[PDB]
């Protein structure tokens, strides 16, 4: 149902984009004036799309819409080229100094590009069979998972060290399912028949269900002030609502099959 | 132009001769009632045999262009021979052949091998070579994957009472499990990833686990090869992986060099 | 109860030599025919005697048993001889490409000894004191807990990393154990105190109750083809009968305690 | 040898100080102004210290040196108030989006606080008697190092995953050799020994130094830029500079000792 | 009221420790070669010295007079300062290898001297009227202890038969839990005062509580598998007492704490 | 080469009479200093057992090569018996501390039984020396691994034990050798069961080799123990001769494995 999915898809991403430049623009030196010029550009680019999807509705045009998602992805490609510039200087060494990670720069725009991507599929018809969704969607997500249980680890106080330790097995538990992904993709399209797949997603489920539950208590406890981290507490909600929307499109999938 | 010729023929030689022992290694795991299965297995064979003696009578001063077509229909016995794997692998994912004795992942790993195959001929024909760079990530992305497979599957071919052999094997299995993330990684952050200094990094990283894992499947093969050990791991598949190891480490120091 | 015993015995056992017989079949390669059709001659002959055994009842004549188990027992030394001779040609190296472990086959003659001297038990009337019964009993079928463990862990896919995983913490489990259990043994019967006992006892059920109901689970998902394995629908529900065995036997122990 | 001593001691923590507040400055976010500029104001007198430090020599007047460690006190005793005052504010919350881990803040506190105490140590005539220096630094550096090996695993991206897992072995062997130096510590003077402190110098010495190894490379590394971080090539050079002085430090306690 | 409080306090403390110091008296002697009479000897007066502070603080009460009670501390704490000095004497011997033979662990040695500080610094923190405030108190108290209980964990461990091998695998777990507890709380205290935020104090209350209710449980399962002896040690049936105990303890300051912070 | 795989019948008795009455005199010894002050029947009857391995090692000692191989046969049968008695002394031991009836000692259940267990095996030995009844080569090397790698283990769990705790470098690799050991016996016990199957050259070939490597290793770390607790370098509970006792038993299992080796 395009203008229900179309709208769902932007008000997620959007908030994530906008979201993105402000953590990218956290961690630029601040002598980096023209970037973080153009991240608090982005931001504003973003938070505006956000309001508009926001003031949309199913009932609104199908046509307006399409308009709004051929708009979107042409801002999904440029925040995408600019994380990769900002990727290319920070692997060259031209940032001494900075403090974005070049995997959260890589991750991002790794989003940005699902986000545009997915805006594609839906002007063009082209969403996903379900045997093919499952595969793709985990393969993505279980990656983004992995990836958020090492920024994390990562970005706590190193004193935190049963924290530390504790996201850490998480960073195992997702490498070790992404690979699991990574070979039922390989052997597709034999690998897709219901009780493979459903099997599948069972095993991902009970994972992403703990992260999403830990993500969330390590929110309100740097909220609260309770642990040392040099994680931005928006950050921390950040990957929660991630790994929410990964939870539910498993649980969806797993209806629908 | 003769330099096509020698890459054409090294490749043949030794991709052709991986896929004739695929044919005789898969048939090894067939159950004794699935006669089409193993006489296809045998026509593959019997065909790749025939394709790796011919690679070996042809040299550096054969007609270009008849290389150029011995290519084509290597390329389609590839292609084929890829065909066919993947239904062996249908069959075994939907419970088919109960009893059988192929993993799967074996059966996706060779079918792999035949993929890799497939486009390297297409590349030489159409003299689409990749640049250093793509190539150092591409070539090694395919395979540290299939150091890792072959870990795993030497670990789970040996018998569980060897338990020094299979431990060893689990720690080799576990970092190139770890090197191919690394190099997903990279792959992911190209072509910004791609500088000089960052793939040396790579590549040196690379050779020293290569060059060890090549080491302990020469001494596994040696010592099957002896009945020192209890598998069951047919001495030449050690071979076989053991001649992938040394493949790879050739390349991976040919682009070591390329660019330091 | 020497009948009812006996039939209980010969009822679960025969029906666990027909099907090694069977596993050890598919190990065989293609050109072994002598050694498939020897196979295939004890399928038939314990099958044979599974059926003589579930139309016997308590009531039977007790001659008419204790000559059952002269006949079964010698069966039993027989395919024992003949597991044993697949050994000595595996460990030589004499048939190249055959797919049977060699732990497999000394563990299939394991409990075919087993047997083999269990019936001797029955009909010499030499069956053991509940003290030795209990670490005897529990040193043999802990080992071939930790046997399964890594059977089960070698012959699931390696791709199956979650599940192959669980079974190699399995394994490590029952190795503990096994290793506790022989050192109990030496220290007999100094050793064979109720509390010691009792602890003993205790200790392998938690574990032995884990495993059955991790092989039941494995089973299941092996005939709904959910996991990629080359783990037979039937092997899995042959080590889930020897699991399920072993804790009669253990909780049985432990009342008589 | 009290100038000897004081000027080497002042040349090297001086250097450190000054870097400290380099890398201090780099975790601030831009609109703590006033911070900044404070960083930026040590930064300045510990460079002027060290220049100082590195003009004076073994032959200069002792006065003028006890004067100048007295003020080289002073500097350390209020960059270590600067340092606790930054962790306050990021403990209680007050900085968010800010980029220096508290640990680091408090291990950087930590390390002014042994600079000031040495002042003292050399203008009192108060230096340890070496059984009491060999357990009182080694328990202090075997914490820098284990601190270091985590600020390591952390700042590298983590994407380099057989860096970070080596780093990471590294913390674990230092947080072990460190427990060992707190226990030999709670079981003074009687653990004082000669043949107790020998072996813990030689337990001790075998991962320095295979720590200042993995340090100097992982420093080259990241010049070249041949590796994944957010470490400054700075801070490599730093703390592998604070592995080298543990180092030379055990090797002359062994040479006393024996 | 506030003399009453003192006096509850001081007999709690008294009670607890003397009991404490009488038990290390015990333990030590065991771990003494038969020929060191004098030692043994000193270890024999020391059990009977506590064991009659112990009775006396058993038999005063509440209602007690403060001066007396007062009076009653100073004197304690002599005996706790004689019995650190005594343990430390013997720490001594065997880290210069004049006892060839001898079972005490030196870690337990070193281990019995720090409770025995512990005690003769609380009561003068008590006779002086220089209690902790409640931010210094969950630091100090926290450190002594996760200390304490990562050294049991290491008792245990050692003592059981090493063919208990899994009971030996979660005694070395637990070990590890506790360096890892212990060390978060030298790092917040280094960080203190900063760290002393009611925030930061009740989550590090939380976690290490999670931690200690579960090796008290543990303790004293271990000590009854061993009065009923089902299970291989060398572990006297008390000493598991006696660190069960310790960790009731400090699970009780941990709670009485958390309270008092919210 | 010293004697440890000698088939003359002599010669071999007084190596296996020399090592072992020497390894069960220390045994009497160590097991002693654990009993509690109290228990002087015990201290007593390990004091006697001191004495007579103590007297037979003197013997062992004056005999040569060119002794009458009578007297060697009625000696070994002294012996024989003398190894029963220690070890139903031990198992005696064993019981009151598996009854919980010894509060407060301080032998380990796992070492008294260890020490039966090598006594058991002199036993053993010195029947196959009277009887004429030394095992064939595939037989030793499979019975020899098995008994040893087991001793092996448990000297690495009594070393890992009795270290201090506070000496966690050391602690770890005590721990470590017990682990590889627990690992090797469990390989020699599987290629025991599959046995006589097993017993191919290559096998054992393979089997030593690899048992090789870890025990000179463990060999290695008990002399190196053994010297820093003589230095009093290191914190623990061991005795000096505990340390030299098992480094001299790790050192005897060495030879047999390279022996083994040559003959193969
Ligand atoms: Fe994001
Ligand atoms: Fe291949
Ligand atoms: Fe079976
Ligand atoms: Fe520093
Ligand atoms: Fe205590
Ligand atoms: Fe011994
Ligand atoms: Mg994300
Ligand atoms: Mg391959
Ligand atoms: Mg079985
Ligand atoms: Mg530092
Ligand atoms: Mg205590
Ligand atoms: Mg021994």
């Known amino acids: 149902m395009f203008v229900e999915r179309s709208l769902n898809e932007i008000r997620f991403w959007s908030r994530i984009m ?31 799309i956000e309001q508009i999807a926001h003031s949309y509705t199913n009932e609104t045009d199908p046509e307006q819409i399409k308009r709004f998602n051929a708009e979107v992805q042409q801002a999904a490609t440029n925040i995408w080229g600019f994380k990769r510039k900002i990727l290319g200087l920070i692997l060259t060494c031209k940032l001494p100094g900075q403090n974005n990670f070049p995997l959260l720069v890589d991750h991002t725009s790794r989003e940005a590009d699902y986000f545009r991507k997915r805006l594609i599929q839906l002007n063009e018809g082209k969403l996903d069979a379900l045997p093919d969704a499952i595969i793709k969607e985990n393969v993505f997500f279980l990656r983004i998972m992995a990836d958020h249980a090492k920024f994390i680890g990562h970005l706590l106080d190193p004193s935190e060290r049963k924290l530390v330790d504790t996201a850490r097995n998480f960073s195992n538990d997702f490498d070790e399912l992404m690979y699991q992904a990574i070979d039922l993709e390989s052997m597709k399209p034999q690998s897709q028949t219901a009780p493979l797949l459903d099997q599948f997603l ?41 790994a929410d929307r990964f939870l539910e499109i498993i649980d969806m999938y797993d209806v629908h099959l």
Not at 26 to 34: A, S, V
Request: glycine letters at 2%.
């Open 202 to 242: 069972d095993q991902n489920r009970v994972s992403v269900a703990s992260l999403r539950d830990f993500k969330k208590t390590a929110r309100d406890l740097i909220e609260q002030c309770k642990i040392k981290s040099i994680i931005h507490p928006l950050l921390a909600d950040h990957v929660f609502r991630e």
């Open 18 to 48: 906008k979201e993105h430049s402000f953590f990218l623009r956290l961690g630029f030196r601040c002598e980096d004036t023209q970037l973080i010029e153009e991240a608090n550009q982005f931001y504003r680019l973003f938070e505006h």
